[PDB]
Motif scaffolding. Structure first.
Motif, short mmCIF file in Angstrom:
data_model
loop_
_atom_site.label_atom_id
_atom_site.label_comp_id
_atom_site.label_asym_id
_atom_site.label_seq_id
_atom_site.Cartn_x
_atom_site.Cartn_y
_atom_site.Cartn_z
N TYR A 170 24.91 -7.31 108.17
CA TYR A 170 25.97 -6.59 108.60
C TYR A 170 26.11 -5.29 108.86
N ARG A 171 24.59 -4.56 109.47
CA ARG A 171 24.10 -3.38 109.70
C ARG A 171 24.45 -3.13 110.67
N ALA A 172 25.03 -1.72 111.78
CA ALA A 172 24.89 -1.46 112.31
C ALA A 172 23.56 -1.44 113.64
N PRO A 173 24.04 -1.87 114.57
CA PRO A 173 23.00 -2.20 115.75
C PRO A 173 22.36 -0.80 115.56
N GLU A 174 22.28 -0.08 115.65
CA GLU A 174 21.97 1.84 116.13
C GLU A 174 20.49 2.38 115.28
N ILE A 175 21.00 1.30 113.30
CA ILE A 175 20.05 1.40 113.02
C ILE A 175 18.76 0.63 113.36
N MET A 176 18.57 -0.90 113.95
CA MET A 176 18.33 -1.58 113.80
C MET A 176 17.47 -1.30 115.12
N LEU A 177 17.64 -0.06 115.97
CA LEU A 177 16.73 0.10 117.25
C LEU A 177 16.38 1.24 116.57
N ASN A 178 16.09 1.68 116.06
CA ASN A 178 15.59 3.84 116.01
C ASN A 178 16.28 4.28 117.39
N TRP A 179 17.57 4.08 117.58
CA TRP A 179 18.48 5.02 118.76
C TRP A 179 18.22 6.22 118.64
N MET A 180 18.43 6.56 117.16
CA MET A 180 20.15 7.83 117.49
C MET A 180 19.62 8.30 116.12
N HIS A 181 20.42 9.97 115.81
CA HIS A 181 21.16 10.01 114.47
C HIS A 181 22.01 9.65 114.32
N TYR A 182 22.18 8.55 113.23
CA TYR A 182 22.93 7.34 112.49
C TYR A 182 23.50 8.50 111.71
N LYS A 231 22.11 8.31 126.22
CA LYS A 231 22.82 8.88 124.97
C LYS A 231 21.64 8.01 124.24
N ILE A 232 20.99 7.29 123.83
CA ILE A 232 19.35 6.67 123.53
C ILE A 232 18.62 7.53 123.65
N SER A 233 17.74 7.97 122.73
CA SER A 233 16.83 8.85 123.51
C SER A 233 15.59 8.81 123.77
N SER A 234 14.80 7.75 122.87
CA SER A 234 13.79 6.98 122.97
C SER A 234 13.76 6.03 124.62
N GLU A 235 12.61 6.12 125.07
CA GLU A 235 12.42 4.73 125.92
C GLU A 235 12.63 3.29 125.97
N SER A 236 11.37 3.65 125.08
CA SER A 236 11.43 1.90 123.76
C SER A 236 13.19 1.34 123.76
N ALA A 237 13.56 2.76 123.55
CA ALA A 237 15.23 1.50 123.03
C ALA A 237 16.08 1.37 124.33
N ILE A 241 17.39 -2.79 126.98
CA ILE A 241 18.57 -3.61 126.61
C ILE A 241 18.27 -4.40 128.13
N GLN A 242 17.09 -3.78 129.14
CA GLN A 242 17.28 -4.29 130.60
C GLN A 242 17.14 -5.36 130.98
N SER A 243 15.97 -6.20 131.63
CA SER A 243 15.97 -7.43 131.43
C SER A 243 16.53 -8.38 131.02
N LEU A 244 17.03 -8.52 129.28
CA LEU A 244 18.00 -9.13 128.57
C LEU A 244 19.42 -8.99 129.52
N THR A 245 19.58 -10.15 129.62
CA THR A 245 20.86 -10.51 130.48
C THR A 245 22.29 -9.93 129.42
N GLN A 246 23.24 -9.42 130.40
CA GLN A 246 23.95 -8.75 130.08
C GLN A 246 25.44 -9.31 129.93
N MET A 247 25.78 -9.50 128.47
CA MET A 247 27.22 -10.04 128.51
C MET A 247 28.32 -8.99 128.61
N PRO A 248 29.43 -10.01 128.76
CA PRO A 248 29.92 -9.24 128.35
C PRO A 248 31.31 -8.31 127.42
#
Lengths: 335, 16
Positions: A170-182, A231-237, A241-248
């Motif tokens: 049930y946990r928001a995406p922005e945590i699992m990926l260490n994007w940002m300030h949550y 708005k995603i700070s680190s380039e790892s994050a 996303i990229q070569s992962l296929t996009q979904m609408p």
């Protein structure tokens, strides 16, 4: 006045508790602390008793203990668990180790409930309203729950609810990926996942792997746009996303059919991927879907909560001392 | 009595 303790063996260690607590039975343990159910003879209710046997093992553990105890003593809201008692057999800070926390057990956990029943919209409505009403109060103290799960929502036979057990589906995406300030909208994500499951009776994002979990999410809410990637700070994050296929992004009205349209609206507002645009508790309570129950004057906030301790760097025995103070200074509730 | 305070009739009971 010091109460009289007695000693028995459970789970299987020695529990030493005050005699007000009788008929202890173990309800299960883990990496957190062992828990027994007991009957409180003072209040005549069945209660949960938690034994912390490694509270001060290190700085990390010790500060955590002080953090949780400060918070629980501060939480007083109709929809939030409150601290019914705290005690230790230790007679002096010298011999201080074990900490027990007791809490009121409401009828059942909601994970267990949703098996035993299909919930009417009149149930979900009142259920989601109280989570938000308690969540508003949690956020007003500048706290983030961080671990909203059905397992963490107690409910009784009148469908009254309380948030309990503060801090993997049930946990928001922005945590699992260490994007940002949550920020606090991380709890609104969980509320969105919970509301979906209540309506449909099935888990909305049953992710197996970390990647699987993420996959299942994007197929619904779509892949980040040009605005969020800046708005995603680190380039790892940013490049994960990229070569992962996009979904609408999908239409939720077509995902949840037979659902109340206003409910569908409110889920659109909670499960947005960008945390900046995700709705808040105060804003959620004002949503039309809750028209029946919403009362701006009965949706209180919390007394100011001093977290300054979070800045301090202290030795164990310092945190150990501070927690002992808070245990000595505990004021039991009334009634 | 949050339902009481909102003037709402009582929902179908939940077991248990």
């Amino acid at each position: 006045e010091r109460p009289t303790f007695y000693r028995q063996e459970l789970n299987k260690t020695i529990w030493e508790v005050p005699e007000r607590y009788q008929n202890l039975s173990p309800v299960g343990s883990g990496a957190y602390g062992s828990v027994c159910a007991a009957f409180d003879t003072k209040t005549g209710l069945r209660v949960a008793v938690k034994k912390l046997s490694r509270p001060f093992q290190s700085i990390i553990h010790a500060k955590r203990t002080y953090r949780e105890l400060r918070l629980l003593k501060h939480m007083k809201h109709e929809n939030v668990i409150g601290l019914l008692d705290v005690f230790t057999p230790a007679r002096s800070l010298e011999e201080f180790n074990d900490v027990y926390l007791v809490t009121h057990l409401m009828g059942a956990d909601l994970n267990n409930i949703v098996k035993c029943q299909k919930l009417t919209d009149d149930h979900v409505q009142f259920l989601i309203y109280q989570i938000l009403r308690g969540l508003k109060y949690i956020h007003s103290a500048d706290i983030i729950h961080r671990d909203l799960k059905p397992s963490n929502l107690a409910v009784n036979e009148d469908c009254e609810l309380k948030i309990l057990d503060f801090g993997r589906w049930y946990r928001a995406p922005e945590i699992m990926l260490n994007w940002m300030h949550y920020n606090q909208t991380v709890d609104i994500w969980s509320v969105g996942c919970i509301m979906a499951e209540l309506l449909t009776g099935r888990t909305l994002f049953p992710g197996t792997d970390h990647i699987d979990q993420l996959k299942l999410i994007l197929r619904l809410v779509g892949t980040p746009g040009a605005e969020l990637l800046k708005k995603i700070s680190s380039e790892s994050a940013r490049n994960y996303i990229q070569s992962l296929t996009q979904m609408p992004k999908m239409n939720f009205a077509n995902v949840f059919i037979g659902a109340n349209p206003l409910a569908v609206d409110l889920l659109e507002k909670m499960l947005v991927l960008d945390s900046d645009k995700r709705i808040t508790a105060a804003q959620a309570l004002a949503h039309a879907y809750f028209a029946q129950y919403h009362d701006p004057d009965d949706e209180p906030v919390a007394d100011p909560y001093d977290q300054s301790f979070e800045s301090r760097d202290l030795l164990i025995d310092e945190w150990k001392s501070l927690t002992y103070d808070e245990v000595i200074s505990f004021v039991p509730p009334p009634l | 009595g949050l339902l009481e305070r909102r003037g709402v009739s009582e929902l179908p009971p939940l077991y248990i």
